[PDB]
Ligand binder design. Structure first.
Ligand SMILES: O=c1[nH]cnc2c([C@@H]3N[C@H](CO)[C@@H](O)[C@H]3O)c[nH]c12
Ligand SMILES: [Mg+2]
Length: 280
């Protein structure tokens, strides 16, 4: 790390004193998913740049704003845009907001992201509930929890086998049924790698063989820090593109189309998330 416990406190107290909102839920909006803040009522926005100690969103499709508001009668705070290791941020910076949210009184964290589909049965536009994850950078020691442990947040060796709340994923499926959607709510394992380049065909095949259903360059570190500090976690990936799996294909992954997919699914995702508020 690099932040002191007081640093998180300072930031939390700053927010608590600049808004009347008191969120119980925090939502992290991934690439092209900033539209999830659109239906919040009594909304109050803070650019990340005005919040002490907050990193900056430099990726297109990430507004870089913290939006407090009410969603379906639930007080929430949304990260309209997030941070990634490939931007040059160590995980202790990428996940700074998560601990701030805990110090604000938040109890649940909803993580979302745009991801490449590895499961051949996935189609662009699909919503995949994250049932589990594979932390590749963690295998190497790249972890937000690396270094002295802050007992005021959590224990030295947190368990991750139950990271994605079982109860919330049951409600997610029940709720999806109420939406009367054409496609079924997908569910699977999200694997995180560093980026920023998109994967090669050989890497794609290997990742699928590891048992991964979707691939991305975010989320996992946020989930680890969330669980460490006691937050209930729920999340999903919007399958924005199908990773190229063969050498005969003329396709090629690109951020522009990833952002387009997010816009086309934004509406359906908003309703789903809003409906879910009632479940929390
Ligand atoms: O096929 C993919 N591989 C790796 N990342 C992504 C993404 C996510 N969106 C960004 C790039 O489109 C980046 O932050 C990554 O986490 C979408 N599709 C893919
Ligand atoms: Mg206001």
């Amino acid at each position: 790390n690099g932040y002191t416990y007081e640093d998180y406190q300072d930031t939390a107290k700053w927010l608590l004193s600049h808004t009347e909102q008191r969120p119980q839920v925090a939502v992290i909006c991934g690439s092209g998913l900033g539209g999830l803040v659109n239906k919040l009522t009594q909304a109050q926005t803070f650019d990340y740049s005005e919040i002490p100690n907050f990193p900056e969103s430099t990726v297109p499709g990430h507004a870089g704003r913290l939006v407090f508001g009410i969603l379906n009668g639930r007080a929430c705070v949304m990260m309209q845009g997030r941070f990634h290791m490939y931007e040059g941020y160590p995980f202790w910076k990428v996940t700074f907001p998560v601990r701030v949210f805990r110090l604000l009184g938040v109890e649940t964290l909803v993580v979302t992201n745009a991801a490449g589909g590895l499961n051949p049965n996935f189609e662009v536009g699909d919503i995949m509930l994250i049932r589990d994850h594979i932390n590749l950078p963690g295998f190497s020691g790249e972890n937000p929890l690396r270094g002295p442990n802050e007992e005021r947040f959590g224990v030295r060796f947190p368990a991750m086998s139950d990271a994605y709340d079982r109860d919330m994923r049951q409600k997610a499926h029940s709720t999806w049924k109420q939406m009367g959607e054409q496609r079924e709510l997908q569910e699977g394992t999200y694997v995180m790698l560093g980026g920023p380049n998109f994967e090669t065909v050989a890497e794609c095949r290997l990742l699928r063989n590891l048992g991964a259903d979707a691939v991305g360059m975010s989320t996992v570190p946020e989930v680890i820090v969330a669980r460490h500090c006691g937050l209930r976690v729920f999340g999903f990936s919007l399958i924005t593109n199908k990773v190229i799996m063969d050498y005969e294909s003329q396709g090629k992954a690109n951020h522009e189309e990833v952002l387009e997919a997010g816009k086309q699914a934004a509406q359906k995702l908003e309703q789903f998330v809003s409906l879910l508020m009632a479940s929390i």
